């Protein structure tokens, strides 16, 4: 039922994301976080679908910056953007909640690289076909764990 999603993700959103990554300091540090198991859910249509729903909880638990700093602004914009997009995604069966997901013990630099990739890959699939995220992934979500 979603219309106009194609250009929901402006170029200016992704601009800040790379700025987020460029600004981060190089460190040997690692941290744990939930994310979609790219191997349990191979299909890139349903991967981005599932992965997207979880992002809302991630950004809050993960990407935290000092209030009203250049980066925190970007983060709120991305949550802002995220909320409008929930309408472009058709909800699926509730039993599938918290499946197709795994642990990752990686650098923040890596984690941001994973999130930028979700947004950027979604933009490419929205640009090509806007209504694409309506596909019923209940079939694909059973397949993981």
């Amino acid at each position: 039922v979603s219309e106009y999603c194609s250009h929901m993700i402006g170029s200016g959103h992704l601009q800040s994301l790379q700025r987020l990554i460029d600004s981060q300091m190089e460190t040997s540090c690692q941290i744990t976080f939930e994310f979609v198991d790219q191997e349990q859910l191979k299909d890139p249509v349903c991967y981005l679908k599932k992965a997207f729903l979880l992002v809302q909880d991630i950004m809050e638990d993960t990407m935290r910056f000092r209030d009203n700093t250049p980066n925190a602004i970007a983060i709120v914009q991305l949550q802002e953007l995220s909320l409008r997009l929930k309408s472009c995604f058709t909800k699926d069966y509730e039993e599938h909640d918290k499946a197709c997901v795994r642990t990752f013990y990686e650098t923040p630099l890596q984690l941001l690289e994973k999130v930028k990739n979700v947004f950027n890959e979604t933009k490419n699939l929205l640009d090509k076909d806007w209504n694409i995220f309506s596909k019923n992934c209940n079939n694909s979500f059973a397949e993981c764990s």
Binding site: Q30, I31, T32, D57, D61, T62, T103, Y105
Partner: protein, 188 residues
């Protein structure tokens, strides 16, 4: 997760908020059968303490928002579920973590000839000692024994009256793991 006998294997748990590491009151438990809960160790504000019965078999440490339970050397007793209780004042989260321990199967074969009434009935014995699911079978009489190390053993015999239809092959396997034993020829 899963890991072999003797190995140094690590289990993990974590706090969602990347702000917090030391502040969490982490406390691991081994689930003994029947919904039991045995305390292995506790960690808070970066001071770890392992209980004396588990001392030197387990250890805990921390990095960032992640909590590790290292098993310094795995044995069959350690196969089972583990529970991590992480509290932060009012709020407390309980994350489970299973561990399968594995013994690399040990396939054995030797022949014997019957001593009565003749020396025609050649009997061979294929044996396998693995964990957790060993299983032996002759291609073309099985007692399950339990060993000291906690592993399982089982074997089967095969009677071949003269002439001996050799070579003959037994198939031992431990779930995915698989191996064979071929008997080629007798002494004369």
């Amino acid at each position: 997760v899963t890991a072999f006998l003797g190995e140094r294997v690590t289990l993990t748990s974590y706090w969602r908020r990347v702000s917090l590491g030391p502040e969490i009151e982490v406390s691991w438990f081994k689930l003994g059968p029947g919904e039991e809960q045995v305390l292995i160790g506790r960690m808070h504000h970066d001071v770890i303490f392992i209980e004396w019965p588990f001392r030197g078999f387990f250890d805990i440490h921390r990095s960032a928002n992640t909590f590790f339970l290292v098993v310094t050397a795995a044995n069959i007793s350690h196969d089972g579920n583990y529970l991590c209780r992480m509290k932060l004042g009012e709020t407390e989260v309980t994350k489970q973590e299973h561990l399968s321990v594995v013994k690399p199967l040990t396939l054995s074969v030797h022949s014997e000839r019957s001593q009565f009434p003749d020396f025609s009935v050649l009997t061979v014995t294929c044996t396998v000692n693995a964990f957790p699911h060993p299983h032996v079978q002759w291609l073309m009489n099985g007692g399950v024994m339990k060993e000291k190390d906690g592993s399982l053993s089982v074997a089967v015999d095969l009677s071949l009256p003269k002439p001996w239809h050799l070579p003959v092959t037994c198939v031992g396997k431990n779930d995915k793991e698989e191996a064979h034993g071929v008997y080629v020829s007798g002494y004369l």
